[PDB]
Design an enzyme around this catalytic site. Structure first.
Site, PDB file in Angstrom:
ATOM      1  N   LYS A  48      38.401  35.175  25.381  1.00  0.00           N
ATOM      2  CA  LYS A  48      39.519  35.836  25.177  1.00  0.00           C
ATOM      3  C   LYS A  48      40.580  35.179  26.254  1.00  0.00           C
ATOM      4  CE  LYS A  48      40.034  39.091  22.800  1.00  0.00           C
ATOM      5  NZ  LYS A  48      40.172  39.718  21.667  1.00  0.00           N
ATOM      6  N   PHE A  89      31.245  28.031  34.409  1.00  0.00           N
ATOM      7  CA  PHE A  89      29.950  27.748  35.320  1.00  0.00           C
ATOM      8  C   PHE A  89      29.285  29.108  35.610  1.00  0.00           C
ATOM      9  CE2 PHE A  89      29.919  28.396  40.350  1.00  0.00           C
ATOM     10  CZ  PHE A  89      28.684  27.540  40.324  1.00  0.00           C
ATOM     11  N   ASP A  94      24.212  32.196  34.588  1.00  0.00           N
ATOM     12  CA  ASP A  94      23.830  33.540  34.697  1.00  0.00           C
ATOM     13  C   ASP A  94      23.068  33.758  33.355  1.00  0.00           C
ATOM     14  OD1 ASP A  94      25.126  33.918  36.955  1.00  0.00           O
ATOM     15  OD2 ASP A  94      26.673  35.481  36.167  1.00  0.00           O
ATOM     16  N   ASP A  98      19.151  35.150  33.799  1.00  0.00           N
ATOM     17  CA  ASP A  98      18.890  36.786  33.082  1.00  0.00           C
ATOM     18  C   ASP A  98      17.981  36.325  31.615  1.00  0.00           C
ATOM     19  OD1 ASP A  98      21.160  37.398  34.399  1.00  0.00           O
ATOM     20  OD2 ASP A  98      22.358  37.848  32.443  1.00  0.00           O
ATOM     21  N   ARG A 103      25.639  34.319  23.828  1.00  0.00           N
ATOM     22  CA  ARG A 103      26.855  34.558  24.455  1.00  0.00           C
ATOM     23  C   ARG A 103      27.949  34.217  23.493  1.00  0.00           C
ATOM     24  NH1 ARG A 103      29.064  36.192  29.252  1.00  0.00           N
ATOM     25  NH2 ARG A 103      26.919  35.766  29.955  1.00  0.00           N
ATOM     26  N   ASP A 165      23.029  41.479  43.275  1.00  0.00           N
ATOM     27  CA  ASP A 165      22.571  42.315  41.756  1.00  0.00           C
ATOM     28  C   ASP A 165      21.233  41.960  41.394  1.00  0.00           C
ATOM     29  OD1 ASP A 165      23.070  43.783  39.536  1.00  0.00           O
ATOM     30  OD2 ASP A 165      24.013  41.872  38.545  1.00  0.00           O
ATOM     31  N   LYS A 191      30.837  40.455  42.835  1.00  0.00           N
ATOM     32  CA  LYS A 191      30.361  39.682  41.623  1.00  0.00           C
ATOM     33  C   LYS A 191      31.288  39.389  40.708  1.00  0.00           C
ATOM     34  CE  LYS A 191      26.897  39.639  37.667  1.00  0.00           C
ATOM     35  NZ  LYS A 191      25.465  39.565  37.514  1.00  0.00           N
ATOM     36  N   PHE A 230      37.261  48.137  35.597  1.00  0.00           N
ATOM     37  CA  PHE A 230      37.028  47.359  34.589  1.00  0.00           C
ATOM     38  C   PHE A 230      35.651  47.466  34.293  1.00  0.00           C
ATOM     39  CE2 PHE A 230      35.417  43.164  33.362  1.00  0.00           C
ATOM     40  CZ  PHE A 230      35.991  43.086  32.149  1.00  0.00           C
ATOM     41  N   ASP A 234      33.179  48.582  31.277  1.00  0.00           N
ATOM     42  CA  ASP A 234      32.424  47.723  30.920  1.00  0.00           C
ATOM     43  C   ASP A 234      31.089  48.454  30.499  1.00  0.00           C
ATOM     44  OD1 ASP A 234      32.444  45.156  29.599  1.00  0.00           O
ATOM     45  OD2 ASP A 234      31.059  44.575  31.227  1.00  0.00           O
ATOM     46  N   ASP A 235      30.477  49.057  31.687  1.00  0.00           N
ATOM     47  CA  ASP A 235      29.179  49.829  31.731  1.00  0.00           C
ATOM     48  C   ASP A 235      29.121  51.117  30.675  1.00  0.00           C
ATOM     49  OD1 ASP A 235      28.663  47.814  33.567  1.00  0.00           O
ATOM     50  OD2 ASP A 235      28.510  49.182  35.176  1.00  0.00           O
TER      51      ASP A 235
HETATM   52  C1  LIG Z   1      42.731  40.020  34.738  1.00  0.00           C
HETATM   53  C2  LIG Z   1      41.983  40.213  33.752  1.00  0.00           C
HETATM   54  C3  LIG Z   1      40.608  39.911  33.664  1.00  0.00           C
HETATM   55  C4  LIG Z   1      39.724  39.943  32.640  1.00  0.00           C
HETATM   56  C5  LIG Z   1      40.016  40.901  31.676  1.00  0.00           C
HETATM   57  C6  LIG Z   1      39.142  40.850  30.675  1.00  0.00           C
HETATM   58  C7  LIG Z   1      39.308  41.912  29.507  1.00  0.00           C
HETATM   59  C8  LIG Z   1      38.107  41.687  28.879  1.00  0.00           C
HETATM   60  C9  LIG Z   1      37.799  42.491  27.561  1.00  0.00           C
HETATM   61  N1  LIG Z   1      38.800  43.481  27.098  1.00  0.00           N
HETATM   62  C10 LIG Z   1      38.325  44.242  26.193  1.00  0.00           C
HETATM   63  C11 LIG Z   1      38.790  45.943  26.649  1.00  0.00           C
HETATM   64  C12 LIG Z   1      38.052  45.944  27.591  1.00  0.00           C
HETATM   65  C13 LIG Z   1      36.286  45.835  27.566  1.00  0.00           C
HETATM   66  C14 LIG Z   1      35.866  46.132  28.862  1.00  0.00           C
HETATM   67  C15 LIG Z   1      36.240  46.717  29.952  1.00  0.00           C
HETATM   68  C16 LIG Z   1      37.847  46.999  29.705  1.00  0.00           C
HETATM   69  F1  LIG Z   1      38.367  47.612  30.889  1.00  0.00           F
HETATM   70  C17 LIG Z   1      38.703  46.541  28.957  1.00  0.00           C
HETATM   71  P1  LIG Z   1      39.429  43.833  24.503  1.00  0.00           P
HETATM   72  O1  LIG Z   1      40.823  44.426  24.978  1.00  0.00           O
HETATM   73  O2  LIG Z   1      39.213  42.217  24.659  1.00  0.00           O
HETATM   74  O3  LIG Z   1      38.999  44.432  23.514  1.00  0.00           O
HETATM   75  N2  LIG Z   1      36.661  42.460  27.087  1.00  0.00           N
HETATM   76  C18 LIG Z   1      35.675  41.637  27.451  1.00  0.00           C
HETATM   77  N3  LIG Z   1      35.653  41.107  28.593  1.00  0.00           N
HETATM   78  C19 LIG Z   1      37.058  41.100  29.320  1.00  0.00           C
HETATM   79  S1  LIG Z   1      37.568  40.210  30.877  1.00  0.00           S
HETATM   80  C20 LIG Z   1      41.402  41.398  31.656  1.00  0.00           C
HETATM   81  C21 LIG Z   1      42.175  41.248  32.702  1.00  0.00           C
HETATM   82 CL1  LIG Z   1      43.964  41.807  32.698  1.00  0.00          CL
END
Ligand SMILES: Cc1ccc(-c2cc3c(N[C@@H](Cc4cccc(F)c4)P(=O)(O)O)ncnc3s2)cc1Cl
Ligand SMILES: Cc1ccc(-c2cc3c(N[C@@H](Cc4cccc(F)c4)P(=O)(O)O)ncnc3s2)cc1Cl
Ligand SMILES: [Cl-]
Ligand SMILES: [Cl-]
Ligand SMILES: [Cl-]
Ligand SMILES: [Cl-]
Lengths: 341, 341
Positions: A48, A89, A94, A98, A103, A165, A191, A230, A234-235
């Protein structure tokens, strides 16, 4: 939402040019360079682009518009793509470590016929491409050395967090005693948080002439804290996120992961519950995963999370209030908007 | 021989200090840092330190003695050790990719119980350590950015050469048609010659204030050519080197390697010989390895080599004559001495 996702289209457009310049009168390495192209095309595309895009959006917010010429914006796109390469990278390497299968919906690069452990070199090249790009586009800029150091430091912090980790969560080693709050915060900070949240804003700051130690420290305090939330969300979504809404289905419990959930569960569990976790965590038995989820549920971890997300939101707004100036608070609020959905 | 191998002792002494500074008020990454220490101790120690030492010897030859203070020599030791870390990074990763069993007499790091594919991260850390060391010791020096770029470029050239090698010599793929002279020269130049011969002299040059494009190009022309001969002799000794004199016993033929020998054999072979090679090369059958060695022998490849070593020696002395100035020819002759034994 409609303006942010327009800016996404131009980002991905620039990719072809990224690839073109990275793949130029040296005939007989041609074959290696063609392989470099496949590696880039497969592994840098299909996310994204949140991290890369953050460089571009922030750069536009931080510079006076009558210092934003075509060359300026070119360098912002390029350093955005550098952040995406750093991430490619890390992901490629990773997935090998794992033993992941997929992916971004598709077969992990290393699992592809004829690649295997050669993916180690391919990942190394992705990393190298960052510094080729910085040289090609930024070598004459006064922030050049600052960006090199930033990326190197970001790499080191990430590698260090990865080490921690791996020590904390050995696949095939039930050990809940490693899984403390302090250790969880520490893993997430190194990480994930430095390169995902601090790196791209910091890059934009340097490109904007904002190189002050204190300003960087102020931005970092906000950005590491967003990084922490974040990962915690995510967890939570790994196990409780509607799977048609996220993309994925979760394997944190199977994988003996030091997830936010297990940490919380362990602060709350009776001796008896500790044993249900100890018997069931980090096993691939569907029934053993059922009985962990069920423990988490009985302990109201979804409620604990929602309380945490509220508290975290006030804390973030307080930090922005206190530490954003003299950057526009919009720099930070745009990020808060994308993660506190 | 007795003066060069004294200078070796001080080199290895400095290692403890390298490790100390790389492993320092951040409590809860302590465990990652202890792992960093094991990685460094196991993988950076136990070679002959030719590459690292070359930085130190060259630096001493290129600087006016009344600009060689304790701090100056400290930085030369440290940048020497940076070259050894780059090499440790490549070796650890290379042993994973090739599925090697031993290195420098002992079990490869990744084959050690509890390490496995975590060695990918460990190798990445070894690489990162280079730039921590450059920052810690050289950040105030005018050659700082030059050394960062040199190491980054050296990494990239090496990775690129590795890519080309992997394409050229797939384990489990009898393909002699890939194994041309042009392709062999190209692999050696990128994979071996830049970082083994150009990198350490170039580092010393920059530290000495010799940053000229032309001077660097002149030194490179000599040094890449020495790199080429080094590898060619390395390929010859793999199969014909008395094994108590070298350390090792060779597995180039087994391993489907694009060795100097197979390349030469293929320029000389009849259609019939091509088939003995095609049937036998890149197999682990002792008898199949016997019949390759025997083909090489029947074609007088040992004689071809000796002729090549003589020709190579005159060519190197001519290049030194032509391109050494204004560096002291001793800079280059010290290297020629160690490889044209
Ligand atoms: C600076 C910055 C770096 C990474 C992100 C990411 C958002 C995101 C992401 N966002 C989802 C929502 C989300 C997923 C997981 C944790 C979170 F806090 C928010 P989405 O709006 O694509 O459905 N999903 C999977 N990986 C990533 S990484 C967003 C920001 Cl603003
Ligand atoms: C700049 C430089 C970089 C690397 C070397 C090396 C010498 C060497 C090496 N030297 C043996 C000799 C030798 C082995 C293989 C090829 C060759 F040209 C010479 P030794 O004198 O240790 O018995 N053996 C294994 N690896 C290496 S790496 C030597 C120099 Cl001068
Ligand atoms: Cl410009
Ligand atoms: Cl920090
Ligand atoms: Cl000094
Ligand atoms: Cl070159």
């Amino acid at each position: 939402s409609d303006v942010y996702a327009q800016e996404k289209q131009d980002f991905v457009q620039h990719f072809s040019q990224i690839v073109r310049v990275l793949t130029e009168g040296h005939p007989e390495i041609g074959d290696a360079i063609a392989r470099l192209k496949e590696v880039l095309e497969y592994n840098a595309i299909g996310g994204k682009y949140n991290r890369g895009l953050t460089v571009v959006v922030a750069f536009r917010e931080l510079v006076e518009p009558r210092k934003q010429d075509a060359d300026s914006l070119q360098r912002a796109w390029t350093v955005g793509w550098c952040v995406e390469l750093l991430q490619a990278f890390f992901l490629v390497a990773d997935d090998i470590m794992d033993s992941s299968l997929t992916r971004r919906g598709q077969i992990c690069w290393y699992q592809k016929p004829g690649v295997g452990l050669d993916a180690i070199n391919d990942a190394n090249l992705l990393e190298a491409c960052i510094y080729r790009l910085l040289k090609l586009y930024c070598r004459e800029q006064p922030y050049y050395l600052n960006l090199i150091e930033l990326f190197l430091q970001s790499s080191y912090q990430t590698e260090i967090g990865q080490t921690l980790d791996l020590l904390t969560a050995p696949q095939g080693n039930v050990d809940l005693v490693r899984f403390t709050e302090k250790r969880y915060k520490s893993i997430v900070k190194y990480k994930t948080a430095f390169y995902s949240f601090y790196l791209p804003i910091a890059a934009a700051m340097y490109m904007a002439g904002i190189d002050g130690e204190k300003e960087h420290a102020n931005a970092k305090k906000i950005l590491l804290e967003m990084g922490e939330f974040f990962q915690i969300q995510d967890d939570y979504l790994d196990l409780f996120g509607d799977p048609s809404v996220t993309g994925k289905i979760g394997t944190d419990i199977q994988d003996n992961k030091c997830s936010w959930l297990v940490v919380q569960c362990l602060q709350r569990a009776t001796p008896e519950q500790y044993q249900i976790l100890k018997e069931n965590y980090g096993q691939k038995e569907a029934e053993k995963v059922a009985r962990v989820k069920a423990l988490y549920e009985e302990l109201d971890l979804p409620a604990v999370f929602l309380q945490y997300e509220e508290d975290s939101y006030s804390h973030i707004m307080a930090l922005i209030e206190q530490y954003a100036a003299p950057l526009p608070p919009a720099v930070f609020l745009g990020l808060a908007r994308k993660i506190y959905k």
